[PDB]
Each structure stands twice: as structure tokens, then as C-alpha cells.
Paper text:
The ACD is an immunoglobulin-like beta sandwich comprising strands β2–β9, and the assembly unit is a dimer. The conserved arginine in human sHsps is on the β6 + 7 strand at the dimer interface, not far from the dyad axis.
Here we have solved the X-ray structure of the ACD dimer of human αB [name] close to physiological pH, as well as higher-resolution αB ACD wild-type controls. Two mutations improved the diffraction resolution of crystals of human αB ACD: L137M substitution and truncation of the β2-strand.
Numbering used by the authors: 66 to 151
Write the structure that this text describes.
């Protein structure tokens, strides 16, 4: 989901509730945030399921890639954020 852009901040949210933190990987390639999620076959309420996604976000030009950080909430939302340099 969301791509919030403040004057002095940068923040993107992603609903990854089906993936455990160990099943997710975030990589910063230049000005691109890459999020990869993959989980092997798992039983759920409906049957059995495996999933995989690869999401790419464009970072604003005024954001130092080195300052990008991330976090996961209890509600399974992944947030990637960084300070704006201007």
C-alpha cells in the first residue's frame, strides 16, 4: 500500500501479514527499494498455501540510501523509511 512523502521525511507501508519477518528481505539498489517475500507450503483455515512476491519502490532523489531503515509492526505491516536531505 501507502507511499507517504513529507518535506523532511520519506515513508512507505506494505501489508505483509501472511509473511513472517524471516520470510521477508528488503534490499536497497541505488534509488530503488526492493522487497521480497516468500513462504513455503503452509496449512491455513482453507487448506495449504505457498506465496511469493517481489515489490520495487522508487526512493525520492533527496534521500541518502544509507539512511534508509525499516521496521515491522505487530499487525504485520512493513515500513521502510528515511530522512530527506534538503
Amino acid at each position: 500500500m501507502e507511499m507517504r512523502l513529507e518535506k523532511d521525511r520519506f515513508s512507505v507501508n506494505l501489508d505483509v501479514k501472511h509473511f513472517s519477518p524471516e520470510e521477508l528481505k528488503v534490499k536497497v539498489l541505488g534509488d530503488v527499494i526492493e522487497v521480497h517475500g516468500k513462504h513455503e507450503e503452509r496449512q491455513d483455515e482453507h487448506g495449504f498455501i505457498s506465496r511469493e512476491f517481489h515489490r520495487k519502490y522508487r526512493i525520492p532523489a533527496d534521500v541518502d540510501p544509507l539512511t534508509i531503515t525499516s521496521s515491522m509492526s505487530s499487525d504485520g505491516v512493513l515500513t521502510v523509511n528515511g530522512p530527506r536531505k534538503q
